[PDB]
Amino acid sequence: PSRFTKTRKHRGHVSAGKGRIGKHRKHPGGRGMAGGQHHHRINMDKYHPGYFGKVGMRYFHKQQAHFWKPVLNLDKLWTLIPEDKRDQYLKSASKETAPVIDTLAAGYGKILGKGRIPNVPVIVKARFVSKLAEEKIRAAGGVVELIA
Amino acid sequence: GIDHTSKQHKRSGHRTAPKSDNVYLKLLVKLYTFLARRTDAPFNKVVLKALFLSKINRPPVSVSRIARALKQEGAANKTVVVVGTVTDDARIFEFPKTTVAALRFTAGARAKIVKAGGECITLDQLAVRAPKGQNTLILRGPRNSREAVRHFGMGPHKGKAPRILSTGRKFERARGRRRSKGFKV
Amino acid sequence: RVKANAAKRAEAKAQGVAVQLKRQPAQPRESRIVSTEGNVPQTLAPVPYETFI
Amino acid sequence: AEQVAAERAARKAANKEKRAIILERNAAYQKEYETAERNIIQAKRDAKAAGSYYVEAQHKLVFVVRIKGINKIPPKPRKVLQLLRLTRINSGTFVKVTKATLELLKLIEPYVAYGYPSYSTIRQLVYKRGFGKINKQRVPLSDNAIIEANLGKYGILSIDDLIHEIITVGPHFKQANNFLWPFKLSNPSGGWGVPRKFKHFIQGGSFGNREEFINKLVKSMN
Amino acid sequence: SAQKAPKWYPSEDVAALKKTRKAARPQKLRASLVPGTVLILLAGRFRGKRVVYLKHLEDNTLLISGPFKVNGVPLRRVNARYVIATSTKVSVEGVNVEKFNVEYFAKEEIKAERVEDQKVVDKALIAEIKKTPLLKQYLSASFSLKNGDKPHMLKF
Amino acid sequence: VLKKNPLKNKQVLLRLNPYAKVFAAEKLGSKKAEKTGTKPAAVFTETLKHD
RNA sequence: GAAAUUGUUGAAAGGGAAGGGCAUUUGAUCAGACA
RNA sequence: GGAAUACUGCCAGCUGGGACUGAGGACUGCGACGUAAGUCAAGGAUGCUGGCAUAAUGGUUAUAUGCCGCCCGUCUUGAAACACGGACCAAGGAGUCUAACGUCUAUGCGAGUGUUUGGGUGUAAAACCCAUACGCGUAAUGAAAGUGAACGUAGGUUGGGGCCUCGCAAGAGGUGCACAAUCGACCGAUCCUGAUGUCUUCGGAUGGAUUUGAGUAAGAGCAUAGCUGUUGGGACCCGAAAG
RNA sequence: AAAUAUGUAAGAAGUCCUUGUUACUUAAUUGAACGUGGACAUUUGAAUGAAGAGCUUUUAGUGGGCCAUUUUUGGUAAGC
Ligand SMILES: [Mg+2]
Ligand SMILES: [Mg+2]
Ligand SMILES: [Mg+2]
Ligand SMILES: [Mg+2]
Ligand SMILES: [Mg+2]
Ligand SMILES: [Mg+2]
Ligand SMILES: [Mg+2]
Ligand SMILES: [Mg+2]
Ligand SMILES: [Mg+2]
Ligand SMILES: [Mg+2]
Ligand SMILES: [Mg+2]
Ligand SMILES: [Mg+2]
Ligand SMILES: [Mg+2]
Ligand SMILES: [Mg+2]
Ligand SMILES: [Mg+2]
Ligand SMILES: [Mg+2]
Ligand SMILES: [Mg+2]
Ligand SMILES: [Mg+2]
Ligand SMILES: [Mg+2]
Ligand SMILES: [Mg+2]
Ligand SMILES: [Mg+2]
Ligand SMILES: [Mg+2]
Ligand SMILES: [Mg+2]
Ligand SMILES: [Mg+2]
Ligand SMILES: [Mg+2]
Ligand SMILES: [Mg+2]
Ligand SMILES: [Mg+2]
Ligand SMILES: [Mg+2]
Ligand SMILES: [Mg+2]
Ligand SMILES: [Mg+2]
Ligand SMILES: [Mg+2]
Ligand SMILES: [Mg+2]
Ligand SMILES: [Mg+2]
Ligand SMILES: [Mg+2]
Ligand SMILES: [Mg+2]
Ligand SMILES: [Mg+2]
Ligand SMILES: [Mg+2]
Ligand SMILES: [Mg+2]
Ligand SMILES: [Mg+2]
Ligand SMILES: [Mg+2]
Ligand SMILES: [Mg+2]
Ligand SMILES: [Mg+2]
Ligand SMILES: [Mg+2]
Ligand SMILES: [Mg+2]
Ligand SMILES: [Mg+2]
Ligand SMILES: [Mg+2]
Ligand SMILES: [Mg+2]
Ligand SMILES: [Mg+2]
Ligand SMILES: [Mg+2]
Ligand SMILES: [Mg+2]
Ligand SMILES: [Mg+2]
Ligand SMILES: [Mg+2]
Ligand SMILES: [Mg+2]
Ligand SMILES: [Mg+2]
Ligand SMILES: [Mg+2]
Ligand SMILES: [Mg+2]
Ligand SMILES: [Mg+2]
Ligand SMILES: [Mg+2]
Ligand SMILES: [Mg+2]
Ligand SMILES: [Mg+2]
Ligand SMILES: [Mg+2]
Ligand SMILES: [Mg+2]
Ligand SMILES: [Mg+2]
Ligand SMILES: [Mg+2]
């Protein structure tokens, strides 16, 4: 709000805090990103290396969705089981009856392997798996079941 | 006149009450400046300062970071103080008992702690229980895990992350970011 | 300095303390009595101006 | 509840106890100061008797007054003027002479006047304008408890125990002397001698080593 | 309200004074002021009058008389710092004076007591003055600064 | 509250330094020093009065 | 029914501008406090 | 031969004249003097006496007198300037709003977070309620196909507040979050290596390298709000010659 | 070959003893680097000072300068 602003404080001072020598004029450096390769190159390299020019290939009509594939790490995983149900399955770690987790149903695309789940057996249904995530899963007597 | 050797009328540069405007926080401050003035106990002195601390210097302590500190040798029965909020961490599968004292406890964190039969104390209760801070373990969270500090110190060969909005290739990945486009950083 | 400070530090302790092994700056000199025996003061004056050239 | 007089007693008694120790120490110093003085006097005579020359030790303590104001001073002297705690005009401090302070004085001669202070003027400096530095704060002396409090650690539990440490350049002169705030002298009452200060004493001005003639000045400024 | 009201008020409790240390010790007078000495009044109703010093009263004042019958000045108080003390001097060992205190001069024309006191004391003095020729004239004549007198040079 | 000079306020002079009583009492500030009559060698005088 | 600016009345000052600062005399005017 | 004196210095020797100041408001301290009881000049003025009770003192104001005092605004190295604007007065008269943002801060909730496109409801543009989605965060790296974070108590070392233990204390030891330094490990890119196998060219285990990434290594974000700063907009306000 | 200026050092991140690790390195358990275990405290290693030290983020204005002593270039010289 106007009342808290430093212009209210500048009233009575000649230059509104913009200097008597260098003034406040329309657009000294040029407008916008003018001169980026000339009188504004020092600020552009440093702060923004990589700005000018090209790398990589063009993809006409790239529709994301095609590439939809959220990741879930083992790290969590067990979070996809409601808490009440969760403790029930932790204790009684077994074949015969082991929880089924549709990670596609949780809206994940791929399982990655961030770190240690307990030694409970899990049946893990997913579209994709990192070599390790699946390794770790088996190492507790789970399997991964490949879906779509 | 005087050849001053040092800048005059300098403010100390430390907070002195919280900038916060909450009564309760203001009251806890009342408790502890009293406690600090009259107990020669280091703990109360540290605690008082942390209260003044703004939100960024008060990063959250997680309930997993808690469990780990308790795994220090001879530390498992200490009550941990956190002058800040305490958050929950699904990633640990076995949380210990203990007693945590903190300003806020997120709903899930409070849950997890209480589930293992722990207890959640407020600092004022922590005071009555241990006015000299006996048997307390103070924990701080990570300040430089903020996203902001990624961009601090931006410059050539500092390798530190651009202030950038949209990202992906063709966003600041050409000239000056690779040997094949002018040069590299 | 150190190798030597280890020495007179042990060589003092193993005697009966009293060390003193920080360096000190030049101290002002002390009293003393200069004698005339064989040395009466010669009395010089300043010299006239002369040219030699 | 006792204490009324009860702990007033175990105190006032203990206070009389200290005034005692101070009295005997001051009686001591006095002896030492005159037998010291006389010794030299008779040295000078004895040597003349034997046809020789008694050259006294070079002075170990000098007293420095900042005699120049605050403007247009070159950086090197300036830093030194600060290290000697002479940061405003007419203020003064004690300096223990060694090569490594001798040079310091050398470097600041144009801006100061110094010389060798007598027992008389060291005494009247401390009695009238002696302030201690206590958690900074510059506290006036005026009771011996203040000194004992901060300087007792090193022996030294009276204003005269102070004066003794300075004049005799004690083994704790650093602590003893830094404890004193810089003295803050008024301008000389007589005047400066001289019509222009910023020449050397030896050329009719006021700055430089003026040896024992320092006492006449300071006493006019104290 | 026209104006708010403060949150705090002064106590109207009026403290006591600190226990000051200022003893009222007595006023030794300058040597020149012995009794029997002749004073010049520098100021006051009887300014410029020459007059005899009689007694130092309990309130630091000087007791003088003219004598009345000489120059018109009655028994009186004079303040010691409005007086020049000359070097001439009449013996006063026959003048009682014991009677005369501060109380004596409390305000509360002239009481007969005074008129009689005045006659008694003055007769003693006159007896004495008469011994030295010209004094009575002197005592009767007003002191005055003449051109070229330098008070800082004159002996009185 | 108010710094009192010793040097000219006997009360506190005596407060600091209790030797002050005896010093004044035994005059001390005017000690009559021992009269000894040693005389200087003529080597000293000649060279003092030389040229 | 302001101000610039004007008339009148009253008071004052003015030897090539006027106005201003510190200070006090003199004139005019006034508050407070006594009890 | 024996003195004196000057000169310089010292005294916690005595003592006169004069000026300015009198902060503080029970007591509390350090002392001094007394055989003592007491006294005191010892952590800041009291005692006694008088005059007016009013324009006396004081404020204001005008004038006089001593000394002093150029016209402001500006741009400038430098203005009182023989630099510019301003005869006078009133009333208008210039850093704003918006979109998206950086740092900082306050607040809510927290591995999440954001009710307000919409729906429900209403005392009707408000307040109250809410399903599905979405956005940003919770994963990085490659041009890309693509792969994708624990050797270890999520490591060693050094400093580290705080705590624990011993000690009357001084100290000694234990543990050590944040943060900092340094050596490692993990994930992707690059370059080597190329096991068991094979639709004989697929497959790429394993162990590596002065390479490299805006990464991992017991999450910190999301949202509202504020000041300052950033960009675009008439963009602090008035101004061309032109098109 | 000066004076004035100028680099570094004046300890606990130190000094000494014992004898682990390696794919580097030596004829060589030789060395090199990093260590484990042990010995010596504030006269622990010159002066003086220190209204403390260290660190982080973000932002204004500025980017016409002129003068004095000394050193000094061009110029006969200059308020150059
Ligand atoms: Mg705004
Ligand atoms: Mg407002
Ligand atoms: Mg305002
Ligand atoms: Mg201002
Ligand atoms: Mg301002
Ligand atoms: Mg203003
Ligand atoms: Mg300004
Ligand atoms: Mg500005
Ligand atoms: Mg301007
Ligand atoms: Mg410019
Ligand atoms: Mg581009
Ligand atoms: Mg994760
Ligand atoms: Mg992150
Ligand atoms: Mg010094
Ligand atoms: Mg004098
Ligand atoms: Mg004079
Ligand atoms: Mg004189
Ligand atoms: Mg002259
Ligand atoms: Mg003086
Ligand atoms: Mg008293
Ligand atoms: Mg007297
Ligand atoms: Mg007559
Ligand atoms: Mg009308
Ligand atoms: Mg006036
Ligand atoms: Mg008072
Ligand atoms: Mg007062
Ligand atoms: Mg009246
Ligand atoms: Mg009145
Ligand atoms: Mg009146
Ligand atoms: Mg008028
Ligand atoms: Mg006027
Ligand atoms: Mg003038
Ligand atoms: Mg201009
Ligand atoms: Mg110009
Ligand atoms: Mg001109
Ligand atoms: Mg112009
Ligand atoms: Mg004009
Ligand atoms: Mg207006
Ligand atoms: Mg309703
Ligand atoms: Mg409606
Ligand atoms: Mg409802
Ligand atoms: Mg729906
Ligand atoms: Mg991101
Ligand atoms: Mg990708
Ligand atoms: Mg492939
Ligand atoms: Mg290591
Ligand atoms: Mg330790
Ligand atoms: Mg350790
Ligand atoms: Mg790698
Ligand atoms: Mg690459
Ligand atoms: Mg990134
Ligand atoms: Mg703009
Ligand atoms: Mg236009
Ligand atoms: Mg046109
Ligand atoms: Mg055109
Ligand atoms: Mg150097
Ligand atoms: Mg040092
Ligand atoms: Mg120091
Ligand atoms: Mg300090
Ligand atoms: Mg800046
Ligand atoms: Mg800048
Ligand atoms: Mg430029
Ligand atoms: Mg700039
Ligand atoms: Mg100059």
Chain B positions contacting chain A at CB under 8 Å are 90-91, 93, 154-156, 162-163, 169-178, 181-182, 185
Q: Round to the nearest angstrom and report the end-to-end CA distance of chain F.
A: 64
Q: Which residue is nearest to nucleotide H139 (CA to C1')?
A: A71
Those residues with Cβ within 8 angstroms of residue B148's Cβ, 6 or more apart along the chain or in another chain: none
Q: Tell me the two tokens of residue F1.
A: 């509250």
Q: Which helix (H) or strand (E) holds B14?
A: none
In contact, E91 and E36? CB cutoff 8 Å? yes
CA distance linking residue E129 with residue B56, whole number of Å = 104
CA distance linking residue A143 with residue D34, whole number of Å = 103
Q: Report the structure determination method.
A: X-ray
Gaps in chain C following residue numbers (C to N > 2.5 A): none
How distant is the Cα of D77 from the closest Cα of chain B, in angstroms?
12
Q: Tell me the two tokens of residue C35.
A: 């004698």
Among C26, C27, C31, beta carbon nearest to D55 = C31
Q: Tell me the two tokens of residue E2.
A: 């026209």
CA distance linking residue F9 with residue B143, whole number of Å = 63
Around ion ligand 21, residues with a beta carbon closer than 5 Å are E 28
Those residues with Cβ within 8 angstroms of residue D78's Cβ, 6 or more apart along the chain or in another chain: B3
Chains with ≥3 CB–CB distances under 8 Å to A: B
DSSP string, A46-101: TTSTT-SS--S---TT--TTTT---EEETTTSGGGS-HHHHHHHHSS--SSS--EE
Q: Round to the nearest angstrom and report the end-to-end CA distance of chain D.
A: 50
Q: What angle do CA B58, B62, B63 make, to 5 degrees?
A: 140
Q: Is D100 exposed, middle or buried (0-12, 13-18, 19+ CB in 10 A)?
A: exposed
In contact, D92 and D66? CB cutoff 8 Å? yes
CA distance linking residue C4 with residue C10, whole number of Å = 10
DSSP letter assigned to residue E3: S
B40 CA vs H179 C1’ separation (Å): 26
| Residue with token string 């095609």 | A66
CA distance linking residue B55 with residue E55, whole number of Å = 88
Q: Separation of B39 CA from ligand 30 center, angstroms? A: 73
In contact, B63 and B38? CB cutoff 8 Å? no
Those residues with Cβ within 8 angstroms of residue E23's Cβ, 6 or more apart along the chain or in another chain: none
Q: Which helix (H) or strand (E) holds B53?
A: none
Among F3, F17, F43, beta carbon nearest to D140 = F3
Chains with ≥3 CB–CB distances under 8 Å to B: A, D
How distant is the Cα of B122 from the closest Cα of chain A, in angstroms?
27
**C-beta pairs of A118-127 under 8 Å, 24+ apart in sequence:** A118/A78, A118/A90, A118/A93, A118/B93, A119/A93, A120/A89, A120/A90, A120/A93, A121/A93, A121/A94, A121/A95, A122/A77, A122/A98, A123/A98, A123/A99, A124/A77, A125/A100, A125/A101, A127/A69
Length of chain C: 53
Chains A and C contact (Cβ–Cβ under 8 Å for 3 or more pairs) = no
How distant is the Cα of D56 from the closest Cα of chain C, in angstroms?
4
Which ligand has the minimum distance to the alpha carbon of residue D221?
19
What is the dihedral angle through the alpha carbons of F37, F38, F44, F48, rounded to the nearest 10 degrees? -20
Those residues with Cβ within 8 angstroms of residue B121's Cβ, 6 or more apart along the chain or in another chain: B79, B99, B100, B101, B129
How distant is the Cα of C30 from the closest Cα of chain D, in angstroms?
4
- The nearest alpha carbon in chain B to D86 belongs to B3
Cβ of D81 and B5 within 8 Å? no
CA distance linking residue E16 with residue D110, whole number of Å = 57
E3 CA vs H183 C1’ separation (Å): 73
CA distance linking residue B177 with residue A52, whole number of Å = 10
DSSP letter assigned to residue E58: T
Scanning B144-183 for CB atoms below 8 A from D yields: none
Using the Cβ of F19 and the Cβ atoms of chain D, whether some distance falls under 8 Å is answered with: yes
Q: Strand I: which bases are under 7 Å from protein Cβ? A: 5, 10-11, 14-15, 40-41, 43-52, 54, 56-58, 60-64
Q: Which residues pair with B62 in a beta bridge?
A: B87
Q: Is D23 exposed, middle or buried (0-12, 13-18, 19+ CB in 10 A)?
A: middle
Chains with ≥3 CB–CB distances under 8 Å to F: C, D
Largest distance between two CA atoms of chain B: 69
Taking CA atoms, B116 is separated from A77, B78, B112, in Å, by: 21, 16, 7
Least Cα distance to E52 among E91, E24, E21 occurs for E91
CA distance linking residue D129 with residue D94, whole number of Å = 13
